[PDB]
Amino acid sequence: VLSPADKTNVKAAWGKVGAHAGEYGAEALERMFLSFPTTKTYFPHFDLSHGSAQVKGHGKKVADALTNAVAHVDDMPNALSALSDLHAHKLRVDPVNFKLLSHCLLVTLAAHLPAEFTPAVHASLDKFLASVSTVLTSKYR
Amino acid sequence: VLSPADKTNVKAAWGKVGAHAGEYGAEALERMFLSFPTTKTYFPHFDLSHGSAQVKGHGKKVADALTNAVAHVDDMPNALSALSDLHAHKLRVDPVNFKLLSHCLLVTLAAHLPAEFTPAVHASLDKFLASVSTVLTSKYR
Amino acid sequence: MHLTPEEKSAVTALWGKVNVDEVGGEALGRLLVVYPATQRFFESFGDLSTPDAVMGNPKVKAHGKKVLGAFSDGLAHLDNLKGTFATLSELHCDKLHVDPENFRLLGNVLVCVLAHHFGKEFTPPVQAAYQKVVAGVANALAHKYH
Amino acid sequence: MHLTPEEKSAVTALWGKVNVDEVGGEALGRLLVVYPATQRFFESFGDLSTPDAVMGNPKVKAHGKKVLGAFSDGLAHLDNLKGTFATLSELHCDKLHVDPENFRLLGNVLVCVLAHHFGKEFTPPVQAAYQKVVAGVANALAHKYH
Ligand code: HEM
Ligand code: HEM
Ligand code: HEM
Ligand code: HEM
């Protein structure tokens, strides 16, 4: 679970992302598609080229969901209910993929927040993304 | 999450296991050691030879724990509390390994319960083992 | 694929006892039941509403025969799986868009099915040999992804 | 292993600027902090109770330097990782009893450290080349397990 210090760390870090959240979300997806090519199997309908507006658009939606999760860190399941339904019943993304996106998001944060990305913050963010991942796949079966 | 029908399926299948729980537990471990040799890295202190008392003994402690969880299927977190602390603070087994043991327990049950191992029971048992694994790795960080 | 001669024989010998059509239908149906996300590829198959509907769906059964027939032919080429599955690897990536993780799920459901089917004859050493084969095949099918 | 000319140059170029002592210490320290279960292999290292304790531990920094130094050697033999790491593969299995899954965790933590240290220069394509390299290394280290 997320301790009070974990919650503090996540809110601080995310706070600093601030307005760049959408740009960081797109960067994270781009990192994921290049590093883990199998993830491209869920977006056969997207233009996955560098700078693609579809990826940028998708990046903002993902980032916006994470902002919503940080805001409701104490009641994630309800905040993310509609997104859990979506992933479980329509998208049906294998749960392994969430770990690959989470890793890419961490890489993106590291690359943009040198000062803020301390070992303690790194650990809290990893725990937070694992929690979001868990909520998102909780209704698969 | 385990639905009410899941709980009924587990209880029904585990009931049949009955008195063979310990011999099944030993068999599942032997299947794991053979199929996934990296799991042996956690038992360097054991005689892992076929039928060793060490494996038979461990297999019985593992089944007993499973029996306790089925009995307290509505409150696993509290029921495996102690087990969850030991794995998180002393044993520190990488979570990947739980998925390999779970698989070998399902194979064991399949090989022994021809009548009871229907698609629906299989699904319920898979979910149950996944739940147990989650509770056991829940205090890692 | 590196299997000792002993392992290859264990594989070949049990396989000789398999009804490919039957086991095929069972394995694919069980994948769909145990791991419902996998139904994402089979929406045109009709009714997958319950375990019974899935196990009994003629389209599921036909697809399982097809998948296990290929698997079956692959057991003849244990020494060249990558070669044997190269075209299917490309197809699955480029046209079907199947996350290779599903090959791993099917391989584990297949082992459970064989265990259910063979009971005591599916010994720990026989399982180990089949585990290597299912991983081999999964790897071979994921090989051409890009 | 198989790297495009583009991937090899991205890898080689970045590594020329890495202080192994420094990155090694950071990589191992972050592993022990982010994935505390990994501490099970370093009982004799001292105090690992807090991030600060872990990060300034001289035994951690020393070990970190050794690991990345061996990692730097494999970079010089990308065409034969398995041959390069066979001895350490056997050591890690037979004497150390380290679950190879830990090789993968370290690989991911190293990528994070490189992104942290290099910022904007650690582009998506550069990361991708490094992801292939750490998986290769992890595979080479688990190769002699039995
Ligand atoms: C932290 C993890 C994730 C979050 C917060 C997240 C969030 C979202 C959001 C907000 C949407 C848009 C829903 C809408 O259309 O209103 C979405 C859709 C989608 N997600 Fe997830 N997602 C996550 C992980 C993943 C992963 C790992 C994959 C696969 C590699 C994935 C695949 C998709 C796809 C294919 C869509 C639909 C895109 C479209 O066609 O427009 N998601 N997700
Ligand atoms: C269903 C999942 C599991 C259950 C229910 C379980 C249960 C147990 C129990 C009941 C004990 C004995 C505790 C005592 O003696 O007080 C134990 C110890 C142990 N377990 Fe877990 N375990 C599980 C998964 C695993 C896995 C996957 C591994 C490693 C591959 C593992 C490695 C160990 C080890 C090394 C010990 C100590 C053995 C000894 O020295 O006696 N366990 N576990
Ligand atoms: C042992 C693993 C597998 C083997 C050997 C295999 C083999 C095949 C073969 C031989 C075909 C027909 C190719 C053609 O139309 O020429 C096929 C098609 C297909 N497979 Fe795979 N398959 C495997 C696993 C999977 C899995 C796990 C899934 C999805 C969960 C999947 C989804 C599909 C789909 C959707 C088609 C097209 C069906 C159609 O158009 O009727 N396959 N596969
Ligand atoms: C990048 C992958 C790795 C490489 C290249 C590597 C390399 C090495 C080398 C060169 C040694 C020194 C051998 C000696 O002279 O005693 C060593 C020892 C050791 N390694 Fe690994 N290592 C790696 C990953 C890991 C991981 C992930 C762990 C566990 C988390 C680990 C645990 C150990 C331990 C416990 C020792 C013995 C240290 C001591 O003597 O106390 N290694 N490793």
How is D51-114 classified by DSSP, letter by letter?
HHHHHH-HHHHHHHHHHHHHHHHHHTTGGGHHHHHHHHHHHHHHTT---THHHHHHHHHHHHHH
Residues of chain B contacting A138 with CB distance shorter than 8 Å: 1
From C99's Cα to the closest Cα of chain A, the distance in A is 6
Q: Do chains A and C meet with 3 or more Cβ pairs nearer than 8 Å?
A: yes
**Closest CB to C97 among A41, A97, A141:** A41
A89 annotated among ligand-binding-site residues: no
Distance B131 CA to ligand 1 centre (A): 25
**Closest CB to C99 among A88, A94, A140:** A94
Residues B13-41 as b or e (16 or more Cβ within 10 Å = b): bbeebeeebbbbbbbbbbbbbbbbebbbb
From A101's Cα to the closest Cα of chain D, the distance in A is 12
CA dist B122 and B141 (Å) reads 31
Look up residue B134 and give its two tokens: 């989650």
**Closest CB to B141 among D36, D93, D102:** D36
Nearest to A12 by CA among A109, A101, A108, A98: A109
A28, with CB counted inside 10 A (0-12, 13-18, 19+), is buried
DSSP A37: G
Experimental method: X-ray
Instruction: Among the bound ligands, name the one nearest to the CA of residue C97.
Output: 3
Q: How many residues does chain D have?
A: 146
Look up residue A19 and give its two tokens: 């307005």
Give this entry's resolution in angstroms.
1.8
Chain D residue with minimal CA distance to A110?
D116
Look up residue D55 and give its two tokens: 């990060």
Chain A residue with minimal CA distance to C35?
A141
Chain B residue with minimal CA distance to C34?
B123
CA dist C33 and C27 (Å) reads 10
Look up residue B138 and give its two tokens: 């829940």
- Chain breaks in chain D following residues, C–N > 2.5 Å: none
Question: Chain D within 8 Å of B141 (Cβ-Cβ)?
Answer: yes
How many helices and strands in chain B, by DSSP H and E? 7, 0
Residues D126 and D120 sit within 8 Å (Cβ to Cβ) = no
Binding residues of C: 2, 63, 82, 92, 143
Q: How many CB atoms lie within 10 A of CB A90?
A: 9
Note whether D127 contacts A117, CB cutoff 8 Å.
no
CA dist B85 and B91 (Å) reads 9
Fold of C1-146: Globin-like (1.10.490)
φ/ψ (deg, to 5) at B117:
-85, 60
Q: Do chains C and D meet with 3 or more Cβ pairs nearer than 8 Å?
A: no
Look up residue D47 and give its two tokens: 């105090």
Instruction: Among the bound ligands, name the one nearest to the CA of residue A42.
Output: 1
Question: Chain A within 8 Å of B127 (Cβ-Cβ)?
Answer: yes
Q: Which class is A1-141 in CATH?
A: mainly alpha
A115, with CB counted inside 10 A (0-12, 13-18, 19+), is exposed
Count residue pairs from B and D with Cβ separation < 8 A: 38
B117, with CB counted inside 10 A (0-12, 13-18, 19+), is buried
Distance B120 CA to ligand 1 centre (A): 29
DSSP D48: -
Q: How many residues does chain B have?
A: 141
- Residue C88 CB less than 6 A away from ligand 3: yes
A112 annotated among ligand-binding-site residues: no
Q: Tell me the CA distances in angstroms from A124 to A1, A7, A119, A127, C47, one per residue in order.
A: 10, 8, 9, 5, 44
Nearest to D45 by CA among D56, D35, D108: D56
Q: What residues contact C126, with CB distance under 8 A and at least 6 apart?
A: C10, C14
Residues of chain D contacting A40 with CB distance shorter than 8 Å: none
